[PDB]
Design a protein around this ligand. Structure first.
Ligand SMILES: *[C@@H]1O[C@H](CO)[C@@H](O[C@@H]2O[C@H](CO)[C@@H](O[C@@H]3O[C@H](CO[C@H]4O[C@H](CO[C@H]5O[C@H](CO)[C@@H](O)[C@H](O)[C@@H]5O[C@H]5O[C@H](CO)[C@@H](O)[C@H](O)[C@@H]5O)[C@@H](O)[C@H](O[C@H]5O[C@H](CO)[C@@H](O)[C@H](O)[C@@H]5O)[C@@H]4O)[C@@H](O)[C@H](O)[C@@H]3O)[C@H](O)[C@H]2NC(C)=O)[C@H](O)[C@H]1NC(C)=O
Ligand SMILES: OC[C@H]1O[C@@H](OC[C@H]2O[C@@H](O[C@@H]3[C@@H](O)[C@H](O[C@@H]4[C@@H](O)[C@H](O)O[C@H](CO)[C@H]4O)O[C@H](CO)[C@H]3O)[C@H](O)[C@@H](O)[C@@H]2O)[C@H](O)[C@@H](O)[C@@H]1O
Ligand SMILES: OC[C@H]1O[C@@H](O[C@@H]2[C@@H](O)[C@H](O[C@@H]3[C@@H](O)[C@H](O)O[C@H](CO)[C@H]3O)O[C@H](CO)[C@H]2O)[C@H](O)[C@@H](O)[C@@H]1O
Length: 298
């Protein structure tokens, strides 16, 4: 349960240790993922002092036949297996249509190298969801020790419309406008051969483990209390469903999840997701990540 610092990324460090993925959105969102040079020129990525900002374009009214709203998807150059990743996050994207995520996967063999969604939601709908998406023969037990609430317990992407096996965080301030009003917080994910765990601690938590909040070079997860989400190996060989994964942080719009009319309008958002995203640039001023650091331990 003891790990030691492997990477400590702050501010401009992200520009040399991650790349921007200028790809068509795998989730079919109303987005134009720009490359690193484009992001920096357009100030969609800003990386200086103790701050990384990743944001959507909030000035352009989109041509409906042209590409989607400019945004970014950054990916660590390094990959990881058994490790702990800690994200010190001051702000996450908000706004109707938004679908931000901080997560890990192996894109090159998806879903067979696994996927763990650490921070994720849509359309400002708290709470946070933590979810695995895998190949066949990977499920979760109905009862296991965690503070969050399991929804779906089958992780296999070819089941249930690829909901994955998810857990909802117990507090509103785990996600969205609630999280942002509270100044964010910390997300930590420990992955071993035997399990994946995620902890969320709000910015104002009186009980955030010092390991998580201060980022010393040595940590011990035994001292961290019960995880928010727990994915044991009872009904899933975790180690055989996950391989070496990159860390990804992104913001898309609409698409497979956020763009479903029932979900978008269910969230109180007007009209169609694509129309809204095209025509309301100012509504995306607060569609930004503000990240203080990301640390990895091995
Ligand atoms: C590209 O896009 C970027 C990013 O959006 C644009 O950058 C912004 O530029 C604008 C205009 O120039 C800046 O706006 C001004 O900011 C003034 C204040 O700046 C200083 O304070 C900011 C707030 O700091 C506090 O909060 C944060 C947490 O959010 C703490 O980390 C920090 O320590 C401070 O904590 C104190 O206050 C809180 C309460 O709020 C307490 O709880 C604490 O205990 C503390 O008492 C801060 O964000 C700024 O940091 C930036 O700059 C420093 C270098 O000085 C760097 O180290 C950081 O990494 C970061 O980059 C700064 O210290 C404000 O008074 C004024 O009214 C105005 O709003 C804005 O700060 C920029 N945002 C950044 C840099 O993140 C940029 O303009 C654009 N570029 C182009 C080319 O267009
Ligand atoms: O549990 C919270 C929340 O999860 C939502 O799902 C999130 C994931 O949504 C994914 O897209 C899916 C699509 O994959 C799915 O289409 C399937 C096809 O991909 C596949 O080829 O064929 C089958 C039919 O055999 C399709 O079902 O369609 C659903 C919508 O019906 C999409 O949501 C994203 O790719 C993935 O990144 C997300 O994790 C649920 O949609 C939501 O209901 C639930 O509340
Ligand atoms: O063409 C066949 C089929 O494609 C479908 O879409 C999926 C994508 O949803 C999927 O997206 C993955 C993400 O959900 C996950 O979060 O990240 C990974 C890594 O970036 C993505 O690959 O990608 C797969 C494989 O390319 C696609 O098949 C449509 O949903 C489906 O309707 C269509 O028939």
């Amino acid at each position: 349960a003891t790990y030691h610092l492997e990477d400590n990324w702050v501010g401009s460090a992200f520009l040399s240790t991650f790349t921007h993925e200028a790809i068509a959105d795998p989730t079919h969102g109303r987005v134009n993922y720009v490359d690193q040079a484009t992001a920096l020129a357009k100030n969609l990525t800003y990386a200086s002092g103790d701050t990384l900002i990743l944001r959507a374009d909030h000035t352009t009214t989109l041509s409906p036949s042209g590409p989607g709203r400019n945004s970014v998807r950054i990916r660590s150059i390094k990959t990881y297996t058994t490790h702990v990743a800690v994200f010190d996050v001051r702000h996450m994207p908000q706004g109707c249509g938004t679908w931000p995520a901080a997560w890990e996967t192996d894109e090159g063999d998806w879903p067979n190298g696994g996927e763990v969604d650490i921070i994720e939601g849509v359309n400002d709908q708290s709470p946070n969801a933590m979810t695995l998406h895998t190949g066949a023969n990977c499920a979760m037990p109905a009862s296991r020790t965690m503070t969050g609430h399991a929804t779906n317990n089958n992780c296999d992407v070819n089941t249930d419309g690829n909901t994955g096996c998810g857990v909802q965080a117990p507090t509103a301030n785990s996600y969205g406008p609630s999280f942002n009003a509270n100044g964010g917080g910390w997300y930590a994910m420990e992955r071993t051969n035997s399990f994946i765990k995620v902890w969320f601690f709000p910015r104002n938590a009186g009980n955030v483990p010092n390991d998580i909040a201060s980022g010393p070079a040595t940590i011990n997860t035994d001292n961290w209390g019960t995880p928010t989400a727990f994915f044991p190996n009872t009904n899933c060989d975790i180690g055989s469903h996950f391989d070496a994964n990159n860390i990804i942080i992104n913001l898309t719009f609409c698409g497979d999840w956020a763009g479903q009319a029932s979900i978008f309008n269910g969230a109180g958002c007007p009209g169609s997701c694509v129309d809204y995203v095209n025509n309301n640039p100012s509504a995306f001023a607060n569609a930004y990540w503000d990240i203080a650091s990301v640390r990895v331990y091995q």
